[PDB]
Amino acid sequence: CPLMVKVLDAVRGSPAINVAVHVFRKAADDTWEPFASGKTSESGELHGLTTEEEFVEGIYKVEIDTKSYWKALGISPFHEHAEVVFTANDSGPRRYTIAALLSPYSYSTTAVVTN
Amino acid sequence: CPLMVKVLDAVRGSPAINVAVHVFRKAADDTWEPFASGKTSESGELHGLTTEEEFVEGIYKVEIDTKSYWKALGISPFHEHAEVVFTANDSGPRRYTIAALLSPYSYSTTAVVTNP
Amino acid sequence: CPLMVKVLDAVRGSPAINVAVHVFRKAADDTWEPFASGKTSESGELHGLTTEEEFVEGIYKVEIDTKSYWKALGISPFHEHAEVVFTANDSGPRRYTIAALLSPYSYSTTAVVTNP
Amino acid sequence: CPLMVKVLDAVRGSPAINVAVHVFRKAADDTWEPFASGKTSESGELHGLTTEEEFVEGIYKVEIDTKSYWKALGISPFHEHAEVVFTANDSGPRRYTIAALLSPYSYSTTAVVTN
């Protein structure tokens, strides 16, 4: 899998489980075309989003539905979602790991790009 | 000032200066309408984006053009930009500070929301 | 003010108020000597820890008592405290801001270093 | 392993490899007693630090030699090291993952405590 997403919960110190994640690919007319989606597992990870054949160079948006996650845990959140926007580049390593660390009023994201 | 943005550079340990910021608001028809824009100062702060009157209830997106910033410094970063999407003024007028901390392959964003 | 500390609360999206902070400096004999201490204000900032004259070259440790803060709020966090260890004034006097962002199981710290 | 450490590099978007990590346990007289140590692998992870038998309740310090890491990559760092200080508690889940994300002038750490 060339594209993995991993989400952690900074309040509970745990993987963020059952978080919905939507990936889009920027179309020629600048609209965001649905590309892949899933929900994080019990390890807070989401594998199998796409394949090497399908994951061509281009601009992608990974949308993490953090609002719904916090709501289901009874906690009031600030953001509608977390958004990660990046260009996939064949010149760089082959596997992209998009990691996100969630708090109610803050989040951080990190790209781990490896061979 | 009901909406402020502060940006830091985690590589240099300094304010991130001349960072372009674009703010949008979700319209009735569900598209992102331009709302306000500006660039961070030598302190890494962006003030005067909008006014109390104009900053009504809505869903706002604050786009911080981190790629433009890093490339202007001769560096090739991972992200196109940092996007911060939030409902604002849903319980009456608040003051929002959107803070961001920038590294070439990583960023974090925080919101400080106060009631004047 | 050559050494400032700013602390935010990532759960509430607010300044972290009344956070105890203890600063130490590594002594000739390699032990941590007490240097300065204080508590963050309603803005989450701690000013006036030390003076230009007293803040000499050295290795400093800024201990932010995050456990005391969370427990005072009726919350059981993971860390005892957040420790920030750095050489200071090695190239002459600088101004340091140590920023921290607090969650119950996580924190981040940033240094902004300026030359007056 | 009840105690794992994982380190990432926010500048290169990669695991932080060959980072020295020292763990200490607080002794009765308040001194820090060496407990375990190692160097992160090519995945930026360090396994096998200790065992369930050895990892008793108490206060621990995980020291991550970030200064040396940045130096070896030709980059000027701010911190002497990153320090993570915490109480190990038998009332909580069994596996502690101490994660750290490194920049020259900033770092974040997160505890992932699971079953």
Curated annotation (Swiss-Prot), chains B, C:
Phenotype when changing G38V: In AMYLD1; amyloid polyneuropathy with carpal tunnel syndrome
In-chain residues carrying the UniProt-annotated modification Sulfocysteine: C1
Effect of E33G: In AMYLD1; amyloid polyneuropathy
Localization, UniProt: Secreted; Cytoplasm
Glycosylation sites (chain numbering): N89
A biological-process GO annotation: purine nucleobase metabolic process
Effect of F24C: In a patient with amyloidosis
Outcome after substituting V19M: In AMYLD1; amyloid polyneuropathy
Keywords on record: Amyloid, Amyloidosis, Cytoplasm, Disease variant, Gamma-carboxyglutamic acid, Glycoprotein, Hormone, Neuropathy, Phosphoprotein, Secreted, Signal, Sulfation, Thyroid hormone, Transport
Known outcome of mutating E80K: In AMYLD1; amyloid polyneuropathy
Effect of L101M: Loss of tetramerization
Annotated residues for binding of L-thyroxine: K6, E45, S108
Result when mutating K61N: In AMYLD1; amyloid polyneuropathy
Recorded consequence of changing F78M: Loss of tetramerization
4-carboxyglutamate modifications at: E33
Effect of substituting V21L: In AMYLD1; amyloid polyneuropathy
Residues recorded as bearing Phosphoserine in the entry: S43
Record's comment describing the protein's domains: Each monomer has two 4-stranded beta sheets and the shape of a prolate ellipsoid. Antiparallel beta-sheet interactions link monomers into dimers. A short loop from each monomer forms the main dimer-dimer interaction. These two pairs of loops separate the opposed, convex beta-sheets of the dimers to form an internal channel.
Subunit structure: Homotetramer. Dimer of dimers. In the homotetramer, subunits assemble around a central channel that can accommodate two ligand molecules. Interacts with RBP4.
Free-text function comment from the UniProt entry: Thyroid hormone-binding protein. Probably transports thyroxine from the bloodstream to the brain.
Disease note: Amyloidosis, hereditary systemic 1: A form of hereditary systemic amyloidosis, a disorder characterized by amyloid deposition in multiple tissues resulting in a wide clinical spectrum. AMYLD1 is an autosomal dominant form due to transthyretin amyloid deposition. Protein fibrils can form in different tissues leading to amyloid polyneuropathies, amyloidotic cardiomyopathy, carpal tunnel syndrome, systemic senile amyloidosis. The disease includes leptomeningeal amyloidosis that is characterized by primary involvement of the central nervous system.
Sequence similarity: Belongs to the transthyretin family.
Record's protein name: Transthyretin
Organism: Homo sapiens
